[PDB]
Amino acid sequence: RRRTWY
Amino acid sequence: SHEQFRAALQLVVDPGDPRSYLDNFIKIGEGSTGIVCIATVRSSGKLVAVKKMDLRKQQRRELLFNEVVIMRDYQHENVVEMYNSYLVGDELWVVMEFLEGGALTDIVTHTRMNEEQIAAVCLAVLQALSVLHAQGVIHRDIKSDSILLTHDGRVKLSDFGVCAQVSKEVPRRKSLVGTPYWMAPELISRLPYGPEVDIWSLGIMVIEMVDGEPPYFNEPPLKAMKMIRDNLPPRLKNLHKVSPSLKGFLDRLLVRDPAQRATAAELLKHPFLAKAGPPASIVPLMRQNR
């Protein structure tokens, strides 16, 4: 998965 | 409280609504923060990009201010230029430079790059990073998706949505931020960290450029992070497919100890970057040319 975290 | 934050954003953004001068919004892209569209400037026929971010849909709403700080203060040849910011209903819109060559991701997943091309990209990214780091700005989300190209093969860093600043008074950051597979071990280990994390992330992007994927990409995100934190530096799938010069370069990037990892300014002097070709060498890799 190519999704960012905060 | 959403209304509270809209009001806050309004005092910081440009007045007005860009819809008054923009036609033909077409969605081209995505992220965690929101969507990216192409729009036509009515009077000129020129194309710009418009980043739209719904205020209600952010994990950390206060990070939307990053977009404005970078616009106001940190413009550079290898950094996507932002023109204006607006509050449009419940969304922040950033009107910015359109990079028509698309993202490095589409290249990485569809062709093989030679070392002249890899070095060109690394040098462009490192020129950006050394200037950003020298001013205390850490990107925190370096990966091929964050690297955009012009049609004539120029390479620009984008998506500063999760960036942060260090200084004498705030020497380190602590937030868990980024994309699992690209995250530095010290950041995953929840240690205080600085600009070094971008250097690790670039190393993972070198592996992307060689293998087409970051390490442990077939593992669940949470398992991948664990392996990044616990195990020795991740290796290339195909070590015979890199020159010793490229291997020497990557060895300076994928160092577990942040204090031993090379800095962006040091890396600009690495022999491997001597192989970097002109922007023109990147051009054939793009979808419209393959």
Numbering used by the authors:
A (entry chain B): -3 to 2
B (entry chain A): 300 to 589
Sentences copied from the publication:
Most kinases in this group, including those in the mammalian Ste20-like (MST) kinase family, are Thr selective (Miller et al., 2008), while members of the p21-activated kinase (PAK) family are Ser selective (Rennefahrt et al., 2007). Here we show that a residue located in the kinase activation segment, which we term the “DFG+1” residue, acts as a major determinant for serine-threonine phosphorylation site specificity. To understand the structural basis for how the DFG+1 residue controls phosphoacceptor specificity, we determined the X-ray cocrystal structures of WT and F461V mutant PAK4 catalytic domains in complex with consensus peptide substrates incorporating both their favored and disfavored phosphorylation site residues (PAKtide-S and PAKtide-T). As previously observed for WT PAK4 in the absence of bound peptide (Eswaran et al., 2007; Ha et al., 2012), in each of the structures PAK4 is observed in the active state conformation with the activation loop phosphorylated on residue Ser474.
To understand why kinases with a β-branched DFG+1 residue favor Thr, we examined the cocrystal structures of PAK4F461V in complex with PAKtide-S and with PAKtide-T. In the cocrystal structure of PAK4F461V with PAKtide-T, the phosphoacceptor Thr methyl group stacks snugly against the mutated DFG+1 Val residue, positioning the phosphoacceptor hydroxyl in an orientation similar to that observed in the WT PAK4-PAKtide-S complex. The phosphoacceptor Thr appears poised for phosphate transfer, and thus the combination of Val at the DFG+1 position and Thr at the phosphoacceptor site seems to be highly accommodative to positioning an active-like conformation for the phosphoacceptor hydroxyl. The PAK4F461V cocrystal structures therefore suggest that Val at the DFG+1 residue favors Thr over Ser because the additional methyl group allows interplay between the DFG+1 and phosphoacceptor residues, correctly positioning them to promote an optimal conformation for phosphate transfer. Furthermore, mutation of the DFG+1 residue was sufficient to invert phosphorylation site specificity for both kinases on both consensus peptide substrates and peptide libraries. In contrast, PAK4F461V could phosphorylate BADS112T in cells, but WT PAK4 phosphorylation of BADS112T was substantially reduced.
